[PDB]
Design a protein around this ligand. Structure first.
Ligand SMILES: *[C@@H]1O[C@H](CO)[C@@H](O[C@@H]2O[C@H](CO)[C@@H](O[C@H]3O[C@H](CO)[C@@H](O)[C@H](O)[C@@H]3O)[C@H](O)[C@H]2NC(C)=O)[C@H](O)[C@H]1NC(C)=O
Ligand SMILES: *[C@@H]1O[C@H](CO)[C@@H](O[C@@H]2O[C@H](CO)[C@@H](O)[C@H](O)[C@H]2NC(C)=O)[C@H](O)[C@H]1NC(C)=O
Ligand SMILES: *[C@@H]1O[C@H](CO)[C@@H](O[C@@H]2O[C@H](CO)[C@@H](O)[C@H](O)[C@H]2NC(C)=O)[C@H](O)[C@H]1NC(C)=O
Ligand SMILES: CC(=O)N[C@@H]1[C@@H](O)[C@H](O)[C@@H](CO)O[C@H]1O
Ligand SMILES: *[C@@H]1O[C@H](CO)[C@@H](O)[C@H](O)[C@H]1NC(C)=O
Ligand SMILES: *[C@@H]1O[C@H](CO)[C@@H](O)[C@H](O)[C@H]1NC(C)=O
Ligand SMILES: *[C@@H]1O[C@H](CO)[C@@H](O)[C@H](O)[C@H]1NC(C)=O
Lengths: 96, 49, 49, 142, 40, 48, 138
């Protein structure tokens, strides 16, 4: 019973050393927290209907009366992007 | 003070024992730096107008 | 058992440090504090789990 | 190496400027990142390439006992090296007085200010991160 | 954008004086390429 | 498990130059997305 | 005149109303130093789009390994011409150097491929050159 247990726990070294994929259930947590934040930082490139997605171009090129009407398109789409991320994170957190 | 910052963040004149988020610190700029090309001469607008 | 504890400064993600965008963001009320609160609710749970 | 309101060819921003290792071809004026913001620029008076990065910043968390127990508090600068908070001596938090420090301590979670580090462990009273916690009591070991 | 598609047909013309050629179209745009030397 | 950002100190001298051009974790940080450390280190979890 | 020069221009018999003119130095002359039976493949792209005629180009050193090689390269922008005219067709100039009314018989060869509106994914290396790409419709 000792030689069986000692040789069985020996195969755990190989079951972990030999394949790459053994811890996929934990790697998937890291991959989803990375891909969600990498998505969220790409959403800053979306124009949401404004003349530029770069907020300093709006503020370089326009005065207050129509600069604010362009900025508010980006406030709206960015805020929706956060609202999507925080809803997705609350949905995953309740599964973890 | 940072306590007064948390009192406004909680909207309360009493704060209980804990750790609380507050507005980011951000090193603000010391001066402007304007770098156009050092072009010498006025454009020909005064001919076409 | 846990996931990466994350916090976001919504007034810095939404507005690239410009004051005039920060003044438009106040037109939306408490949305930015709800985002902070919900992410804090997740982040304090990871250390519970 | 200093925080400035830069403007290159009309492209206003706020950041620090540094010499790039990047190698723009003669047709390129601006270099760019995943958020389509300008990451680098070619200085039009000398054709030098400058990296642009935002001036140093981070989250700030405040650690307090019960306000009925005391008004004194400690402050944690998130992800920040304690060589950098003395450079954060304008800034967004106008309560500069916490920079007086003397009890500054580096956690891996951030630079922690206004709390004195002590070797003898306790139960976790207020959680900081990365194995640290903070509490309000008299050490009076001596 | 207007690109040349991968693995697409391109017309390889030889041209010679000897000591017949119609005008080519220009629809969307043209990738034009040569290996010919001596600035002929 | 090849972890991405444990949350430990990012002393700015890391971020400027080459690394922010290829590593997304700095671009996240420069946009106010912040990843915090756990309360219990991998040494304290191993001790329990 | 003791010189090699275009003694007459056959190409246009008339030039009746001309509306833009230019002089330059690029358009991909030759390599420096030469090598025995080594050659340079010259690539150009001509794009006409809402009244601008745009040119891009590339030099490619290539050996005795056939032609038009299955490796990779990308064209740099060359000029943006504000011409405002309809292009529907094109032709290319040969220049047989008249050696003895003489017209000694030159020979030449070139490749033509019409562009299309298309979506591409482009790989920029850590130096910022495009080093690979994929056609999202191939
Ligand atoms: C119950 O199952 C056991 C295996 O799971 C088995 O143990 C094994 O027994 C055999 C012999 O019957 C051993 O085999 C070796 O025996 C000698 C060398 O010692 C050689 O002649 C053989 O070729 C072979 O190498 C195994 O070493 C042994 N394994 C362990 C871990 O002890 C038991 O015999 C089974 N018990 C019953 C009651 O059936
Ligand atoms: C905070 O920043 C300083 C640099 O300003 C870091 O100091 C360097 O640390 C390494 C590793 O110990 C040494 O090899 C260097 O010689 C140090 N340079 C200087 C100028 O002191 C310091 O390590 C950082 N602290 C943290 C916690 O990351
Ligand atoms: C294109 O060329 C023709 C020929 O020079 C120009 O036509 C002349 O226009 C003037 C002014 O109307 C008349 O006096 C001449 O009698 C015209 N000549 C002919 C042969 O038609 C024409 O104007 C030019 N186009 C432009 C836009 O300048
Ligand atoms: C007004 C108020 O909050 N008073 C409380 C008191 O009831 C409590 O006994 C004490 C313990 O530290 O803290 C304080
Ligand atoms: C600007 O002046 C400098 C000398 O101060 C000179 O080297 C440079 O060539 C000038 N810029 C341009 C666009 O020529
Ligand atoms: C922690 O203990 C060491 C001795 O093991 C001592 O040198 C050090 O000063 C102590 N830390 C503090 C903050 O005093
Ligand atoms: C390529 O050209 C040949 C004729 O030379 C033709 O048979 C073939 O079908 C063409 N293929 C495509 C995809 O254009």
């Amino acid at each position: 019973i000792a030689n069986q247990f000692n040789s069985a726990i020996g195969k755990i070294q190989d079951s972990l050393s030999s394949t790459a994929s053994a811890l996929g259930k934990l790697q998937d947590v890291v991959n989803h927290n990375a891909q969600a934040l990498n998505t969220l930082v790409k959403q800053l490139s979306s124009k949401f209907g404004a003349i530029s997605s770069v907020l300093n171009d709006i503020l370089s090129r326009l005065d207050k009366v129509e600069a604010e009407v362009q900025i508010d398109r980006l406030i709206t789409g960015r805020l929706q992007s956060l609202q999507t991320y925080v809803t997705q994170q609350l949905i995953r957190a309740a599964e973890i | 003070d940072p306590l007064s910052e948390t009192k406004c963040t909680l909207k309360s004149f009493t704060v209980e024992k804990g750790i609380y988020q507050t507005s980011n610190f951000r090193v603000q700029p010391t001066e402007s730096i304007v770098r156009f090309p050092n072009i010498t001469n006025l454009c020909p607008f005064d001919e076409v107008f | 058992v846990s996931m990466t504890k994350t916090s976001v400064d919504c007034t810095m993600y939404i507005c690239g440090d410009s004051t005039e965008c920060s003044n438009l963001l106040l037109q939306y009320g408490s949305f930015c504090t709800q985002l902070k609160r919900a992410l804090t609710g997740i982040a304090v749970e990871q250390d519970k789990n | 190496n200093k925080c400035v309101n830069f403007n290159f060819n009309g492209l206003t921003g706020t950041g620090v400027l540094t010499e790039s290792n990047k190698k723009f071809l003669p047709f390129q004026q601006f270099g760019r990142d995943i958020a389509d913001t300008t990451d680098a620029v070619r200085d039009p008076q000398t054709l030098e390439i400058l990296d642009i990065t935002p001036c140093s910043f981070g989250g700030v968390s405040v650690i307090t006992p019960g306000t009925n127990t005391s008004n004194q508090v400690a402050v944690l600068y998130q992800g920040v090296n304690c060589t950098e908070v003395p450079v954060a001596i304008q800034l967004t938090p106008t309560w500069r007085v916490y920079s007086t420090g003397s009890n500054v301590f580096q956690t891996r979670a951030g630079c922690l200010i206004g709390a004195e580090y002590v070797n003898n462990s306790y139960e976790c009273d207020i959680p900081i991160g990365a194995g640290i916690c903070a509490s309000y009591q008299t050490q009076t070991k001596s | 954008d207007l690109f040349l598609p991968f693995f697409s047909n391109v017309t390889w013309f030889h041209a010679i004086h000897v000591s017949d050629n119609p005008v080519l179209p220009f629809n969307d745009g043209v990738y034009f390429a040569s290996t010919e030397k001596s600035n002929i | 498990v090849t972890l991405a950002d444990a949350g430990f100190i990012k002393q700015y001298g890391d971020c400027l130059g080459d690394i922010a051009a290829r590593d997304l974790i700095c671009a996240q940080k420069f946009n106010g997305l912040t990843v915090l450390p756990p309360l219990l280190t991998d040494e304290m979890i191993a001790q329990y | 005149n003791k010189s090699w020069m275009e003694s007459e221009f056959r190409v246009y018999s008339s030039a009746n109303n001309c509306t833009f003119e230019y002089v330059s130095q690029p358009f991909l002359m030759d390599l420096e130093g030469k090598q025995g039976n080594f050659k340079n493949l010259r690539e150009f792209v001509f794009k006409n789009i809402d009244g601008y005629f745009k040119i891009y180009s590339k030099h490619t050193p290539i050996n005795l390994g056939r032609d038009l090689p299955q490796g990779f390269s990308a064209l740099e922008p060359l000029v943006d011409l504000p011409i405002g005219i309809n292009i529907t067709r094109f032709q290319t100039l040969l220049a047989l150097h008249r050696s003895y009314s003489g017209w000694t018989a030159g020979a030449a060869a070139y490749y033509v491929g019409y562009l299309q509106p298309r979506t591409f994914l482009l790989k920029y290396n850590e130096n910022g050159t495009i080093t690979d790409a994929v056609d999202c419709a191939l």
